[PDB]
Amino acid sequence: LMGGFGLKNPPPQILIKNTPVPANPPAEFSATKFASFITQYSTGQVSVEIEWELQKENSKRWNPEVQYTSNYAKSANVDFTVDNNGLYTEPRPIGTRYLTRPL
Amino acid sequence: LMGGFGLKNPPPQILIKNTPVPANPPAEFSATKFASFITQYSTGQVSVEIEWELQKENSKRWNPEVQYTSNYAKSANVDFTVDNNGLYTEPRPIGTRYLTRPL
Amino acid sequence: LMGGFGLKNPPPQILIKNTPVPANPPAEFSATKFASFITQYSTGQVSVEIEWELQKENSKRWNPEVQYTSNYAKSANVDFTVDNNGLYTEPRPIGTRYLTRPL
Secondary structure, X not given: OOOOOOOOOOOOOOOOOOOOOXXXXXXXXXXXXXXXXXXXXXXXXXXXXXXXXXXXXXXXXXXXXXXXXXXXXXXXXXXXXXXXXXXXXXXXXXXXXXXXXXO | OOOOOOOOOOOOOOOOOOOOOEOOOOOOOOOOOOOOEOOOOOOOOOOOOOOOOOOOXXXXXXXXXXXXXXXXXXXXXXXXXXXXXXXXXXXXXXXXXXXXXXO | OOOOOOOOOOOOOOOOOOOOOEOOOOOOOOOOOOOOEOOOOOXXXXXXXXXXXXXXXXXXXXXXXXXXXXXXXXXOOOOOOEOOOOOEOOOOOOOOXXXXXXX
């Protein structure tokens, strides 16, 4: 109901954690397991590559259709670019229903 | 007498220690061996994989048998799960004598 | 809406009757067919054998699940057995929704 593709077997969840590396244990044994760990974190890169199957229009409409254009005007800030201090902003939501076809 | 499997040749003991890495020896020689070591410890992972041979029931009992069920009730803490601050608890001992067979 | 398996071609109806064996007809002919039959009935055995395809659980649940157990208590009459004079009784309805899986 939010829109999208309903999938019985969706893309599976990729779960990730840091392996716990404990600090120094005491000299004698104690079975109350571990509260002392080495405070750490990880970083890295992650790349996702989805292939999408397109469906071409077969339209026999005569007149021009409605497009998603950018307003060519004297603007202070370009749409869908970064700001004066590098904040990336998205000025409006873009749907996907622009082309037409008969019912 | 504690229960379990009596084994003449049990699983052998795996013993592990840190190799002693000494600190700086003196300039001249002394044969009173070593009291000065580098204070260290190790960590790692360990995985044990036992394969178990099951014995299926061949029961011709009619009525239902006694099972190990969890009490479905409004509970504050689920049995055999962690607490509000991550302490794993086991609420009761579970035996293994639930199925029946004639003597 | 009663539950079960909706079938376009269900198991076909097996219909059975006793063949009418008439009593003595009169000496002369009469075309008013027959009201006098030999009062009889049949008995026999009937065996039905359905094969059912099961679907195993693939559950990665940790804690124990809810089962159908029989109450182990000092009982006067065992559930789903016969009485003191051989009446077979079923004490409660048993559904089939006991195992769990995520939605």
